[PDB]
Design a binder for this molecule. Structure first.
Ligand SMILES: CCCCCCCCC(=O)O
Ligand SMILES: CCCCCCCCC(=O)O
Ligand SMILES: CCCCCCCCC(=O)O
Length: 259
């Protein structure tokens, strides 16, 4: 069984690497000054934004729109990864859609942590770095979007997970049998069972000194789902205050009738 679990962990890490262009490994090399990668241009105000703006008439809106395109791009990457999770594509098509609908954002903020430190977040495939203070200074409610993600990331990052850990963890998230409107819960839970087994052994092997890291990681789901509920509330505000703004269709279908 252990051999089967090792094989599963390796398959997922392989697909993860193939699906996600900017890994945590690379992100850290950029943030911490490694010679394997290149230094980011740092955006911390209006001017540095304009100078860096080489890589709807208001910086706050423009940044939001930009972040929105990246979210769309991420959903595409996550969708591709999901298909590699054994059993996923064999599930009822309606459930596949539902799993992605509720799962993508929890994964987005999980992986966004990889791009974050206390001071800011990597952007533009790691070529840029936008500071936390700059984002927090944006006119309401745009300045309220990222702060909670930073708070979560600082805590999540303390777990010191690597890409091979994350690959299994995000698979676990996708295969959540508690998603609203699931037609066949059992098949989903059977898959998650295996993934959980795989994650458990992976953490034991990769972090033999970090006791109950498995339990601690699973508990991070609480903060994760808290983030999304808060995020949704913020989107509802802008929808009413900025009637000239359009949320990307892919992103609309995700939030439509969400919780
Ligand atoms: C000022 C940065 C705010 C980014 C918000 C991203 C919204 C898109 C999403 O819901 O996936
Ligand atoms: C602040 C811009 C990034 C917010 C959009 C979500 C990014 C997706 C990701 O990189 O995981
Ligand atoms: C110039 C506004 C922000 C651009 C977002 C590009 C990707 C950001 C990220 O990966 O978190």
């Amino acid at each position: 069984e252990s051999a089967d679990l090792r094989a599963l962990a390796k398959h997922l890490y392989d697909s993860y690497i193939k699906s996600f262009p900017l890994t945590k490994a690379k992100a850290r090399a950029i943030l911490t000054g490694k010679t394997t990668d290149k230094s980011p241009f740092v955006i911390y105000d209006m001017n540095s934004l304009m100078m860096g703006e080489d890589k709807s008439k208001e910086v706050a809106i423009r940044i939001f729109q930009g972040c929105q395109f990246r979210s769309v791009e991420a959903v595409q990457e996550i969708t591709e990864y999901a298909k590699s999770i054994p059993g996923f594509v064999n599930l009822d098509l309606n459930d596949q859609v539902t799993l992605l609908k509720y799962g993508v954002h929890e994964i987005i903020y999980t992986m966004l942590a990889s791009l974050m430190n206390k001071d800011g977040v990597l952007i533009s495939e790691g070529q840029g770095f936008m500071t936390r203070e700059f984002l927090k200074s944006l006119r309401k409610p745009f300045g309220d979007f990222m702060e909670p993600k930073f708070e979560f990331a600082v805590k999540f990052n303390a777990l010191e997970l690597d890409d091979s850990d994350l690959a299994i963890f995000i698979a676990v998230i996708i295969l959540s049998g508690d998603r609203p409107g699931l037609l066949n819960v059992k098949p989903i839970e059977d898959i998650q069972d295996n993934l959980l087994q795989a994650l458990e052994l992976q953490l034991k092997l990769n972090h033999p000194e970090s006791s109950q890291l498995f339990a601690k990681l699973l508990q991070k789901m609480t903060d994760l789902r808290q983030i999304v509920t808060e995020h949704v509330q913020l989107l509802q505000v802008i929808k009413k205050t900025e009637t000239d703004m359009s949320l990307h269709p892919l992103l609309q279908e995700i939030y439509k009738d969400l919780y």
